[model samples]
Target: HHENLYFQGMGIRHIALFRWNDTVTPDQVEQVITALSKLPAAIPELKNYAFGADLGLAAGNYDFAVVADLDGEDGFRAYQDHPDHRAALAIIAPMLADRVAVQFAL
Candidate 1:
């Protein structure tokens, strides 16, 4: 039956890398962390969310990384369109010099 063929356990994982502006301060980074920390609760589709500052071991490494898990493609789309996610991006965008992202099945 179609019901038994569904990929119920499949999910999506999102990874984002960011390079902060030269003028970005510790306080701004803290703000980013705070904003991200609230996303899992703010967006129903967000199964998991975590983010952190990078260690300066590599010269060209991104300043921060974010990892998120969603239930499926629909959940991933919901997260992308969520108002809370938009708001968080608004707060962090100005402090970012560059950003790259990847999404994959998990």
Candidate 2:
């Protein structure tokens, strides 16, 4: 976990980080992870979807990180509105205390 954690960028990326609330439980976290893990297979626009907890090598890191890669801005938008994404978010959103996302061309 000390070295490379990502592949060479091929297109646009929607990177989102999550911080769990103090109220979060293991079940909720696990379920959200399962839902997110299914997105790449459910949504056609998702070229790549990666999720994992932060590398403990650093302090003050977010609880979870998501890398959603798409072909372009259009694919990014499509992924956002997809039912599968919403289904996952429905479970994950309420458990989150804080979140941040940045979209950029890669």
Candidate 3:
């Protein structure tokens, strides 16, 4: 048997890692970052949003990373379903070769 465990916390920290396609250019990455940076304005529940290209210091690391802080699970859901975020994904999704995400209590 298995059970779900929940944590009590003030906020949720969301992190996403992306591996860009080989054909993707720096300009495309910048455009994605710019578009994603606007999400906090459209979704008030998003406490913060930040993203950037990788430093390339480590092998096998993703090409880019996005970090966000939300009020709680509700806030995270709001950000996830928000139109602005969805639109940004539509633009960047095709340029990505791989993606991964993690969310945890803060």
Candidate 4:
């Protein structure tokens, strides 16, 4: 029998690395954090959210990181179109030194 169970409760995963703009200042970091903090409340599709500033040896490779989990592919799609997420991306995109690398997995 074909089992729909195998596909039940699937989700999308995201891992990204960011390099802050060379001109980034402490105040800018604070603002970014404040803006990010509002995203989870605004976007219901987000299942989990975590972010951190790069430290230790890997610090040179990246400025900060955000790892997020969505409920499913549909949930992630919803998030992508979410106005709140879009707004945040608009603000952060220009301050990024490199494009975000994204990966999705079940």
Predicted model with the maximum lDDT? 1
Model 2, residue pairs in steric clash: none
RMSD of each: 6.0, 4.5, 7.6, 6.3
lDDT for each residue of candidate 2 in 6-96, tens digit (9 for 90 to 100): 4333477788899999989878778777887775434545666678876678888888888877766667777878887778788787888
lDDT of 4 by residue, 1-106 (tens): 2122222366666777888878788688777787777864335556677776677575357777777677778777787788877887877888888857685775
Q: Please give the distance, in angstroms, between residue 18's alpha carbon in candidate 2 and its true position after superposition.
A: 0.3
Per-structure clash totals for the candidates = 0, 0, 0, 0
lDDT by candidate, in order shown? 0.79, 0.75, 0.78, 0.71
* Model 1 regions lying over 4 Å from their true place: 1-9, 41-44
- Whole-structure CA lDDT of model 3: 0.78
Provide the lDDT at 19 for model 4: 85
Superior by lDDT: candidate 1 or candidate 3:
1
Can you tell me which runs of candidate 2 are displaced by over 4 Å? 1-10
Clashes of 4: 0
If scored against the real structure, what TM-score would every candidate get? 0.83, 0.81, 0.83, 0.79
* lDDT value, candidate 1, whole model: 0.79
- lDDT value, residue 55 of candidate 4: 70
TM-score of 4: 0.79
After superposition, which runs of candidate 3 have C-alpha atoms over 4 Å from their true positions? 1-9
